[PDB]
Design a protein around this ligand. Structure first.
Ligand code: ZN
Length: 202
C-alpha cells in the first residue's frame, strides 16, 4: 500500500462498502483498470474525516456505504476509453438514459482528470442504522443525469431531504459537496491537491 494512503475500512471500522469499480456493477460493465481489490482506498486524512462523518451519522441512525475513494489515473483513462467506445446499450438504461457516453464527459459527470486520483474524494450514501436499509436518494450511484444533481427536482421531498442530510453530514465533517452528483464529496483541505496518483487499488 502506497504511503499516506490506507484501505478506508481499516480506519473507519463498521463502514459498509462496495467498490463498484472493482466489480462488474458499474457503468463500464466490467472491473475498471487499476482496481484490483474490492476495497475503498483513501488518503489517511480522508479516512480520518470519514470517521468523523461516520460518527456524526448520529444525525440520525445513519451508517455510511462507500462506493469509491482513491481512483488510479489509469481508472480515469479506462473510463475515458469506455466513453469513446460504441454504444452496446449494456449499461445505458441504468446509468445514462437521456444523455450518451460523450455527453457524460461534456457535462462534468466523468472527469478527464479526477479529484479521486488525489486520494481525498469519496463516493457514498447513507443507510438506516435501525432498519439496515438504504436511505433512498432518488437516483443510483453513477446515475449521470440531472436527477443526480443535489439541487434536482423530480426527486421526492424525502429523497431531496435525504441528499441534504448526507451533504450536511459530510460538510460538517470537513468535506465539500459537488452539485452535480449527490454522492461526491472531497475533503476540504486535502493533503495532495495537484497530485494525481496512479498506484493500483491493491
Ligand atoms: Zn466521486
Amino acid at each position: 500500500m502506497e504511503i499516506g494512503f490506507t484501505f478506508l475500512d481499516e480506519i473507519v471500522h463498521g463502514v459498509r462498502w462496495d467498490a463498484k469499480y472493482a466489480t462488474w456493477d458499474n457503468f463500464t460493465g466490467k472491473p475498471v483498470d487499476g482496481y484490483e481489490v474490492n476495497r475503498i482506498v483513501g488518503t489517511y486524512e480522508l479516512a480520518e474525516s470519514l470517521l468523523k462523518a461516520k460518527e456524526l451519522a448520529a444525525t440520525q441512525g445513519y451508517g455510511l456505504l462507500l462506493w469509491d475513494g482513491y481512483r488510479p489515473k489509469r481508472a480515469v483513462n479506462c473510463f475515458m476509453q469506455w466513453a469513446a467506445q460504441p454504444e452496446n446499450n449494456l449499461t445505458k438504461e441504468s446509468y445514462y438514459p437521456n444523455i450518451d457516453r460523450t455527453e457524460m464527459i461534456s457535462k462534468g459527470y466523468v472527469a478527464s482528470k479526477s479529484s479521486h486520483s488525489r486520494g481525498s474524494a469519496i463516493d457514498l450514501t447513507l443507510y438506516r442504522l435501525d432498519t439496515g436499509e438504504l436511505v433512498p436518494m432518488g437516483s443510483r450511484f453513477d446515475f449521470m443525469d440531472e436527477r443526480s444533481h443535489h439541487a434536482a427536482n423530480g426527486i421526492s421531498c424525502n429523497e431531496a431531504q435525504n441528499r441534504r442530510r448526507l451533504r450536511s453530514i459530510m460538510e460538517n465533517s470537513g468535506f465539500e459537496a459537488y452539485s452535480l452528483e449527490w454522492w461526491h464529496y472531497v475533503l476540504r483541505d486535502e493533503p495532495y491537491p495537484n497530485s494525481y496518483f496512479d498506484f493500483p487499488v491493491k
